[PDB]
Each structure stands twice: as C-alpha cells, then as structure tokens.
Write a protein that binds this DNA or RNA. Structure first.
Ligand SMILES: [Mg+2]
Ligand SMILES: [Mg+2]
Ligand SMILES: [Mg+2]
Ligand SMILES: [Zn+2]
Ligand SMILES: [Zn+2]
Ligand SMILES: [Zn+2]
Ligand SMILES: [Zn+2]
Ligand SMILES: [Zn+2]
Ligand SMILES: [Zn+2]
Ligand SMILES: [Zn+2]
Ligand SMILES: [Zn+2]
Ligand SMILES: [Zn+2]
Ligand SMILES: [Zn+2]
Ligand SMILES: [Zn+2]
Ligand SMILES: [Zn+2]
Lengths: 512, 131, 512, 131, 176
RNA sequence: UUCCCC
RNA sequence: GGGAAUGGGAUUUUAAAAUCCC
RNA sequence: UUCCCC
RNA sequence: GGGAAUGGGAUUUUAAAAUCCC
C-alpha cells in the first residue's frame, strides 16, 4: 500500500484537516476532495484550536547526497573505529489519552553504564507551527516492562537530557576517538529517539581547534569536538551500525547468551546497550588476530612497547645467568628470534601457528596443562604474552590482566578484554589459578657494561659489578632510573610478571 | 492506530531534512544530487481567473498559475520542524500559495528559493510588474 | 528481451545501481539508461554501503569444452559406476527481511546416513567485491517443514561443512571407486548447494600418487584422490545424474513406495538421499543381470571365486559319494559344466528365465515351492546361488546373505543387496524361513586323490586315508589348511551353505 | 520477488566460470571452443573526445575506443566470485574502462588478457607508447 | 564449610512444594561412618551420612531454611536486590534468582556493621593465617620505622592502643 | 493465547 | 474438519472487583 | 501465517 | 503501541487462473 507510518497523524479527531492547513494530500478531509484535487468550500471554516500528535516512527536514513556523510557505515569501518563504539538502547512508552498510535522515548541507556529518563515529549501539529511539548503516555502493557512503571514520574526535560548525553559522550570518548559509533540492535526506535538529540549536515571543524566537529550548539550556531563541547546540546554527524542485520535469529538476549555469561538483566536500556556492544565485539573480534588492520596511536603505546621488550630482554638475561640451564623452551613467540642472542643456551621454539615465519624451526604445540605436563620437564620455559590454562613450575611468564581497563584495554566479551595497541587482541578473562606453580617476579636492574662517570643511587636492587664497591657511577645511576620507569610503565599498563619459586638475586651477585 | 499521511516516495528526503541543521540547504543539495522533489502536495481546482497574488485567503491563481494549499508547500510543515521565522509562525499555512505552471513539479523548492514583493503582493521575477 | 533467474538481485532496495557498479545493463538504474545505452550524470554519487544478495538458483551446466569433463552423465555410464553412487538431497531456508527471492542450503544429507546443518550463508554484492557471509533466513511455512525450525540454531560454518563433506566422501569411497556420482531427484537446488562445495576444471592427478584427482585444497592449490584428501575442502570434478529425468511423475516418495517398503521418513535430507539411490538402483538393476557389463576387481574377488569353486566341488563330490543319488538337478545353471565329471550320476540343467539360446539343451524352470515341490522328489537338487521362496528337503544350497554388507555388497532395493563381483547381481532379501527343511553344512574335508607325498594336523574333520593313523601327511595337512582358509573366506564373504537334514559324514568314512 | 540481472544467453558461460578453479583459464578455453563472449555489458553514450586512458572515473573514450562500466568488464564481478588479487578488491569496479573498438565485442576477455602501463595509464599495445 | 545446610528462599511456598521431592525430616541422627551430624539419607540402604560420606545418597536429611521476604520486604526480589547490588541480574533463571536471594540476605545481615559478639568455629588454617599476619605486620612496621625514622605513626582504624613494636622511637595516634 | 488430531 | 486448556495464594472494598506476591 | 521492537 | 514478510521453476488455458515439481 502507498502509505507509511512516518509523520502519521495520531490524533483522535474523526475528521481531516482543511486544504489550507493539511500538510499532505492524505491529510485533507474527505469533504474537500473532488476528482483527485481539492476544492475550496466557504461553508467549512478552518480549525484554529486543534492539536494533532505526529508520529516520528519510520525514518529511512538511506540518503545519497554529495557533500554529506552517511550515518550508517559498513562493518569494516566499524572494526576500524571500535574505539568509538557506544552501545545504545531505548525503552519507550505509549501515547494513550489524546492520541494513540506512536511511542515516545522514556529511558535511554548507553554501554558506558548510564540510564537517562526523559519526560514523554512529542511533536504536536498546531494551526501555526509544530510544537514540541509534553504528551500523555502510559507504560507498555507487559510484565517485562513493569520496572518502567515508576520511571513515568521520574523523567527530565529533554533540554537537560540531551545536554547530559553530550556531556557523557564527550567525557567518555575524548581520549579514545574523534567520533561516536552507535551499536544498535533494532534501529527503528533508536532512530526515533535520535531525532530528539542528533543533527546532521556537511562535515565541519571544531570552533576552537582543528579536530572533527562532533557536537553542535543551538544557542549559538557553533560546532565543537569532544574536548570543547561544554554547554553543547546536540550530537553532530554520528555513525551507527545495526547488529541484527548481520543474520541473527531470535531476540538480543538469546544471541548474547550463546557467547557471554557476565551480562544479563534484559529490558533495561543500559544493560541491553552493553549486551549489544558485547555481541558486536564477539562477532567482529573473537576469531583471530588480524594484522591487516592497523590502529592509530592515542597514548603511550610506544613507551609500553619499548618497555615490554626491555623487560623481556633483562629478565631472560638475568635468569639464564642465575642458574645456567643448558636448554630452554620458548613458547608462544610469533617469530623465531631469541630475546637474548648472546646467551650460550639451546633455544627450542614451539607455537600453535607462527605469524607466517619463513623459519619453520618452530614446532607445533597446541598447549594444555593436562596434556603437556611432561613436554618440558627440564629447562626453563618462556611464556611471554601466551594465554594457557596453567603454567608449569619452571616458567617465566608475562600475562596481561584483563581486569585493568584503560584507553588501550576496552571491555570485551565473556569477561575478556580488547587490547588495542597497534592491532586488536582479544584476551580471555584473567585467572589467578593459572599461577599456582609460580611467584611474582621482583624488580631488579642488571648490566655488565663498562661505565665511566641529583642524589647518587642508593638501592639494593641494582645488581651491577659497579655496585660491589661503595659507590655507583652516574651512567648506571641514569640507566637504573630508565629501567625503573620502564618496569613501572609495563606493570601499570596491566602486565603481570611471574617467575619460578627458586629464583633469587644472590646468584646474580655471583655472576661477577 | 492513527491515519497515515505520507507516501513512501517521500520517506528519504523527509527523513533527511528532519535531521539536518539547515533543512533549506539540505533540500537543495538533495535536489542537486539527483533526488526527486517532494510529492503528495494538495492542489486546488479553480477557474484560473484570480488576482494572481503569491499568498491569498482564497484560491486566486492567474491563467499561468496553479493554487496549492500553503501547508503543503512549506518545507518545515512537511518535515515538522522549527520555522526560522521571527516568532516561529508560518506565512504559507492558513493561506493559498500560487505556483507557476512550469514550476509546479517542485512547489516546495519554489517557495524555498523565491520571495514575494511586499508592495505588490506577488512573486518577484515571476509576474510582478513593478520592476 | 527475456531474462533469467540466475544471479537475480534479491535485495529490497527499490532503485538500481550506478553505471560504474552495475554488473550488467539490467542492473543500472533507469536514471542513466538512454537510447539503449547509459549516461554518466555528473552530480549523482555512487553508493558505498549497499549489500545486495545475489541468487545462486538457475545454473546450467550444459557447457562443451574440450579438456573439461561433463558433470551430468548418462545412465548407461552411471550403471558402470554404480559403486560410486552417493544419493544427495538438500533442504533449504528462505531469505527474509533484508532480501527476498532466493533459497539457501540448510541441511545436506547423503545416502551414507549423515546430515550436516549449515548456517544460512549467501553471496552479497558489495561496492568492493562479492562477500560470502551469513544472511537473514527463515524456515519455509508448512507443517512438514516444522522440524527444520530447530536447525536454524545449530548450523556450522561452511568452511567446516565442506571439510566434513570431503572427509565423509573419502572415507566412504576410497575402497570402492575413483570418483563420485551424485544421485539426485531435482538437480536445481542440488546445483545451487553444490556451488558451495564443488569445483570443476580439467582432469588432474593426485599430488602424492598417480590416481585421479577427486579433491582440491584452496589452502595449498593442490589436488588429491580419496586416499590423500586429508584436510582438503572442495570436491573436484564430480559426476551426477538426475533420476526424475528418467520419466518419473509425482514426488520421490510416491515413486519409491511402489517398489520398496524399507525406507521412509521424507523431508529429512539423508532419508530422501537413501530413497533416491534406492529408486535409481531399482530402475537400473532389479530388472535382470547384464552380463555384458564388467566391473574392475577392487579386492579379493578372485580369491572368493576360487574359494567358492573349491567348496562347491568338495561338497558336491562328498554328497554324491556318500548318498549315491541317481539324478542331480543343477537348477538355475544354464551351462552344462559338471563340477565333478566322473560322478556316476545323470545331470539335468535349467534356467530361471529364458536365455538367448533356443536349443533344447536346457529346460525352463521358474521354481516355487507352491508349484514345483513334488517335481523333484527323487535325487538331489543343487541350488547354487539360486533364490527361491522355499527349498525342498533334498537339496544342497549355497545362498548369499544380503545382510552382510561389504565392499563387494552394496545396499539394494526393498531389503535386497547389489553384489558386484565382475558383474552386478541384485539379490532379494535374506530370510531364514526358506531353509526349514535343511540344516547348516558342517565344515569338513574329504580326500579321494592318491596319498603319494609342518606341524602335524590334529583335527578329526579331515576325512582322508592318512587320518586313520598316527599323523596326517604334510600334503593333506597343508591342503586341509588351504581348504579351511577358503571356507572361512567364503563364509565371511556372506555365503551360507545348507544341506538336506539326512547328510552325515560317516558314510564317507566307509569309502576307504 | 527480486529484480533480474542477467539474460539467458549468458547462462552457460556464467555457470561454467562460477564453478571453475581458474575462471580466467576457463573463460579462455570456453572462447577457444567456439563459445560466445559474455554479453549484456554497460556501454556509455559519450562524445568520444576523451584522453583515451584505460581506467578513469569519467568516460574518457578516444575516437578509437568505447567506454564501459567497470563492473561489467570484470569476469569476477560478472560471475560473483573471488578476485585473485591479494586484497580481494576490484580495480575495475567503480570506474570506467575504455576498450578498443576493434575488441569491443568481448570487453570481459580484453580486460583479462591485457594490462595497463603504469607511467601513462594506457593499455599496453593499444595506445601506449613508451618504447 | 559447615555441618548443615540453610536454604535461603524468597517465597517458601513453591520452595516447600519442590522440597517434597528431595527432602526428608526426622529426629537428629549421626553419620554411619563417623560421629558427624547426619545431613543425607539413603533409601537404598536406610542409612544416614554427613557431607563427607554421602556418596550415592538420594535425600537431604534435616535441612534448615529462612524466608527473606518475611523480613519486611515489598515488591519482587529483583526490585529489592537492585537497591544495593549491581553485580547480579538475569531474573527468572533459577540459579540467578538464588544468587540474588542470598546476596540480599547477606546485605540485610552483614553490610551494616561487624558484630564482634558472634564468634565462628575454626574450620581451617585460621590461626596460622592470624599468626602470619601478626609476624608480617611486626616485621614490616619495625623495618619501616628503623629505615626511615618517621616522627609520628598514625595507626588509622585501630581502636586499641596496642603497639606492634613498643620500643620504637615514635609517637602513636589511634583512630576509629 | 496455546496445544493435540485429521 | 474435530477438540481441549489458560496455575497458586494473600489482602481490601463493595458473589464480584482491585491490589500485591509466586 | 510468522517474526522483531516497545 | 510500532513494524516487516510470506521461496524457486515448468506447463497449459483464457495479465490472470489452474496443474505439477522443488
Ligand atoms: Mg531493550
Ligand atoms: Mg528432500
Ligand atoms: Mg525464580
Ligand atoms: Zn576542539
Ligand atoms: Zn556479554
Ligand atoms: Zn657502572
Ligand atoms: Zn510552514
Ligand atoms: Zn512589486
Ligand atoms: Zn593419491
Ligand atoms: Zn528403498
Ligand atoms: Zn595323506
Ligand atoms: Zn571485479
Ligand atoms: Zn605506457
Ligand atoms: Zn561422616
Ligand atoms: Zn547481588
């Protein structure tokens, strides 16, 4: 049929509108139509006191305009901008008394964890202009929606609500991305609610810097980014993805529960937003690591990457001098390069599948503790950023703590986390039971290089042959501070270091 | 429930200009990129022997003009958004608007682009004889 | 101009494509079409987020290329490769809510008994390429298809489905044939599903041996046979035949039930595949044995034939020497070849059906116990590989057990089996009610040859002159072992030996 | 339901090449055996005064060339199969491809057999002059 | 953990109706293999056992229970649980509702304040952990005070004026 | 509202 | 085409209705 | 007839 | 309260209907 529910008249008046007042041809009264046109009848005066509610349901954002960005994006662009993902859900209420036939936004929830309750407000048609005003409404007729019953008396005016939305989005995303991606399940009512707080147009620039404009103010027609959006009320040019359009059957919870167990509490807007983002992250990221997609630097990724390599070199160089194992096993190394080339030890490499390394010396190993307990009975093992069920008693382990959230460590699926440094690594949930056979590694600095020279260093953790005397030179006094900062940065990023229980520093004091 | 008031062919542009900061610019950019104009306007039937003024209380079109209902030729009344008028009132609504026959394909765009002459009461460049 | 349903655009978008993105002249939008050509309108942008599902229904495999073998073979050719026959049936689901107008494979079934469920996956034209991705789908309406509703929540990815298909086909067919012949009932949706797991090309050879290539691996661009197809993901150059093209009307179940009562349970893919292969076997082999068609010696056929010859010779010689029948009726043997020429007995020969020879050498005999019980009261009847409803009480019978399946014995129609030993013989279902007048033949050896000649034999079933002494001579001691091996091979192959109830070996012992 | 894309005269060659391991070799062998070229391509009405480059964003056909839509001159876009490029993307889709008017009867085969010179953007052996 | 079971319920009606299927009652008994309280009963042998010896037993013998809704709550379980806790959710799944019920009971009984009047039995390793904590605290406070020589040590949160190192040259302040 | 049978 | 069923309890008000819990 | 959203 | 969808093909007769197969 040649009708749509967009801009539907929900008023209870049995008659239509006058030809000089009806917005469309389907809105004019039947008494005026004649042979497909409308004829002015002096006997029917136009109405000057009517109020007609207009439905904002049924938007179609499929415009193709030359200088305008498109709101809906492809899945590859969403994978690129995963740092900007904010789940979004809306729970609504039904217009009841003076108008029936539309739903109004009641509780808007985001994956950040907030719920904003708004006064039921609609767009009514008056003889002068469309008026944005409060309308009578009732909660949906269902038991599942009974928790929405109090919220009808707890809403805020939309002027407050949209300013709070802009504040929350800017405070969440200003150190992560230059845009917002809304992760939706069903976009119809989400778009109907976005009509209340989202405006679009050509791409712009912030009024105080060179960043992309993300917010618009109607008090003064100015555009700003996340950093300069204080007092701004509208979201300008957002992006969105609909997850249900990825071939899903059933509802949101039935699909989320197949892959995750730590989120629940359906029909709450924030909880469903978290569920939507979790399902999207699972569908786009928990398969394998993709090195064809690269992410921009937003912080201390370079320092973390350097500090990890520095610690990995120093710990292994100290361990191979402490007890002098004749052979070691390196497990989980993507490429066949030993951490310390100068070591006089037999390196044997094992991995499930290397990162396309030409050196095929790496043996196949799909490790499991109950299966490979007798594989590495002798010699020190290395597990650097390798995630297994349990480590043996003779290992040196670096493990990332998924419970440490930061700009690099986004929330993940089923208790895991999405670590985005240069690529996106999905890490399963941290378990301390995997470290029952090990102990936490202490901090220490070690070097054998010759040295030549504001308080001088006074610490028992500087294991150097220079420190055997009563003083230490300035070269090691600076390099120890550099390694201390590197170790602090590495442990603050979320990395935990574990060593075998027999490890101690005294043997290192015997290396001189 | 309710009465449907819009045709599906208008679903795209009306969804566009409703979200746009500047609906008048958005409509012109939509037209300039190959989009079709707004349909489903109310068209009046008359003897075409009127005065020819731009906006009138009664249909008063000339021989080369067609009268439309004023609410259907205002873009903001179609998109149900804020009028940029000084008090938010509409000048077309409650009146009948005269569109030239050659421009009758896009009556919304004609009302957006063109203006009226305050001392003669008809469209500038499209029939006003004072210039 | 007429159009075809192949590669149909199933997407719900009302407009066409840009002239730079439309794959054909029918796909481009009517904005650009002009005078049978297309126009580049400067202002119109091209779509960059469309997802257009493409219909894979309507393939025509009637190509004629010199180096490329044809998939659809004739039934005269399929009869020669009956050992490669695998029935194949697919159930489907309908694309919905983002595209309407195509069907996707849901459950794949084979005559081997397996069922594989796949997630609904389609080919989607995108502005960069064609994406093979999961799409929205629903089960067909109808009561008969309601059992397909649970299958929407348990599908596997297609990359796993085709690995399992190749594994199952190689496990079934590596000891039967060097190819696969798919037995189909409607080849339309069968071809639409074969698009997902079948590749074609010129004839190749296995990478590790000189056998015909039946599988292809995309991960290594290599070809393999059934023996070497571990980890291969495509079926390379298969053959197929459509049984419904043989003149059938109605559905598959209607035509199958006319001849067979064993199989049923329609609309499950494996059951339909079993019914299709059963109907093909009935149409090709239940009529009569064709001696003109020979089959390759896959394994142990010559040994079983020699064992059968030796056992028949020994048992007929022993019976004729022990009981001294006046006449032996070699029922069912058109040839007058005496298995023991020197026996003091006359021979008569019959055929079940009239042969091409019109001479009076043999007599017609369509034996049934209700009509021919008293025609052979005297003497003995040699029912070697002749199937009757019931045997008389004076017979020596060898009967094949159709319930003993092997590489030489394939499942047949209505409970029978197709035994392929240099020829295809369809044998009716085995019933133990046909031997109520007989008894199982004991294993024994008899020697009538002169005894002129390493462990000494200590078995009392060796009826020979040297057994009446301290030890059996090493000639008979090894000949008895050879006959025991022949007997064990024959009775393991499925042959059951029966003799009249008054048979006893002691009458042989008085011969010496 | 749905809109048809192809004509019956392409049913064989598009079914063949969509099943082959090597679709370019399959199409060449199909043509060698007397098969007919893939038809129903998207040809442009242009002024034939362009620069004559092989692949452009606008129809730039020389007087000795004819301009086609790119997605209609790609076998892999025509058979809806994977592109053999390492990235899997198409160099022809979204562009205009100029085919010489002597080889314009089979543009799909021409785009398979030929290649583009990097320093001038012409088809090698067809309008290219760098040696 | 214990020698009994206390079932934490929200509406004991259908809970009792279900307990009819797997609960037996009677006078107090003793385990068949030891001197512990009997918590399980076996119909196949007419014998009673504790938690340690209940292999193959099919009934829970003499359990205890408490109804939390009788403590004055109004509304449903989720409504009252969400007032204090944000970790648990997913109502109308039985295990999740049980977790919410026990969480609400724990909140109503223990989140207020620690009750020093109620003591609990030493199930295992509690005295060793207390002695270890005492020794570690003494060593680390002595080492810090000897190394850095602070003028004042603020023993925050300790109502008692018990000095872990009496001979340290430092003044002590105590707070609650 | 849901299920069974034909 | 044939047929069946739509749980338990508490409280209040005037058998019925409402509210609340499961 | 079926599904999604509230 | 809002909204969406109801697959593919062949044949015959007069775009539609019917039949048949999946
Ligand atoms: Mg929700
Ligand atoms: Mg079937
Ligand atoms: Mg419960
Ligand atoms: Zn800024
Ligand atoms: Zn989750
Ligand atoms: Zn030094
Ligand atoms: Zn207006
Ligand atoms: Zn004027
Ligand atoms: Zn091989
Ligand atoms: Zn059968
Ligand atoms: Zn002998
Ligand atoms: Zn291409
Ligand atoms: Zn060149
Ligand atoms: Zn006990
Ligand atoms: Zn809790």
């Amino acid at each position: 049929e040649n009708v749509t529910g967009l801009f539907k008249d929900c008023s209870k008046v049995i008659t239509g509108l006058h030809p000089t007042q009806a917005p469309t041809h389907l809105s004019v009264d039947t008494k005026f139509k004649t042979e497909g046109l409308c004829v002015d009848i002096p006997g029917i005066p136009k109405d000057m006191t009517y109020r007609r509610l207009i439905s904002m349901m049924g938007f179609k954002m499929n415009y193709q305009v030359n200088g305008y960005p498109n709101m809906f994006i492809t899945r590859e662009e969403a994978i690129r901008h995963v740092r900007a993902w904010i789940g979004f859900d809306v729970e609504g209420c039904h217009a009841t008394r003076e108008a029936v036939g539309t739903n109004l936004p009641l509780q808007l929830g985001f994956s950040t964890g907030v719920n904003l309750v708004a006064v039921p407000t609609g767009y009514v048609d008056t003889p002068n202009n469309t008026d944005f005003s409060r309308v009578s409404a009732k909660p949906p007729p269902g038991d599942q929606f009974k928790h929405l019953i109090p919220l009808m008396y707890k809403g805020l005016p939309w002027n407050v609500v949209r300013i709070k939305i802009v504040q929350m989005l800017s405070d969440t995303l200003k150190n992560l991305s230059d845009r917002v991606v809304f992760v939706l399940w069903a976009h119809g009512f989400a778009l109907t609610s976005m009509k209340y707080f989202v405006k679009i147009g050509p791409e712009r620039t912030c009024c105080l810097c060179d960043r992309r404009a993300t917010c618009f103010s109607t008090a003064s027609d100015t555009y700003a980014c996340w950093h300069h959006s204080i007092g701004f009320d509208y979201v300008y040019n957002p992006f969105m993805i609909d997850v249900q359009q990825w071939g899903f059957t059933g509802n949101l919870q039935s699909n989320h529960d197949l892959y995750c167990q730590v989120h629940g509490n359906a029909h709450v807007a924030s909880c469903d937003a978290i569920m939507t983002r979790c399902l999207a992250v699972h569908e786009c990221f928990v398969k394998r690591v993709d090195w064809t997609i690269e992410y921009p630097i937003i912080g201390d990724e370079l320092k973390i990457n350097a500090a990890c390599r520095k610690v990995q070199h120093m710990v292994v160089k100290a361990a191979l001098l402490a007890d002098k194992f004749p052979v070691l096993h390196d497990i989980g190394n993507p490429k066949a390069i030993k951490c310390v080339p100068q070591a006089d030890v037999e390196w044997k490499f094992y991995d499930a599948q290397p990162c396309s390394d030409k050196a095929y010396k790496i043996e196949e190993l799909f490790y499991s503790y109950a299966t490979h307990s007798d594989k590495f009975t002798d010699g020190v093992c290395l597990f650097w950023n390798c995630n297994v069920d349990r480590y043996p008693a003779n290992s040196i382990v670096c493990r990332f703590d998924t419970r440490v959230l930061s700009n690099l460590n986004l929330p993940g699926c089923d208790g895991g986390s999405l670590y985005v440094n240069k690529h996106a690594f999905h890490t399963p949930a941290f378990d301390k039971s995997a470290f029952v056979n090990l102990k936490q590694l202490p901090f220490f600095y070690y070097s054998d290089s010759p040295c030549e020279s504001y308080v001088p260093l006074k610490s028992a953790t500087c294991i150097t042959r220079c420190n055997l005397g009563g003083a230490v030179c300035r070269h090691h006094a600076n390099e120890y501070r550099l390694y201390l900062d590197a170790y602090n940065m590495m442990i603050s990023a979320g990395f935990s270091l574990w060593v075998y229980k027999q490890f101690d520093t005294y043997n290192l004091w015997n290396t001189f | 429930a309710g009465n449907a008031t819009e045709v599906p062919a208008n679903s795209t542009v009306l969804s566009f200009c409703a979200f746009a900061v500047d609906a008048a610019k958005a409509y012109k950019d939509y037209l300039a990129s190959g989009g079709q104009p707004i349909t489903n306007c109310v068209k009046m039937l008359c003897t075409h022997t009127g005065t020819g003024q731009a906006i009138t209380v009664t249909p008063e079109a000339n021989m080369d003009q067609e009268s439309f209902g004023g609410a259907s030729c205002c873009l903001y009344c179609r998109c149900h958004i804020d009028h940029p008028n000084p008090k938010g009132f509409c000048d077309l609504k409650g009146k009948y608007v005269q569109i030239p026959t050659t421009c009758a394909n896009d009556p919304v765009g004609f009302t957006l682009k063109n203006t009226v002459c305050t001392v003669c009461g008809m469209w500038k460049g499209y029939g006003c004889s004072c210039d």
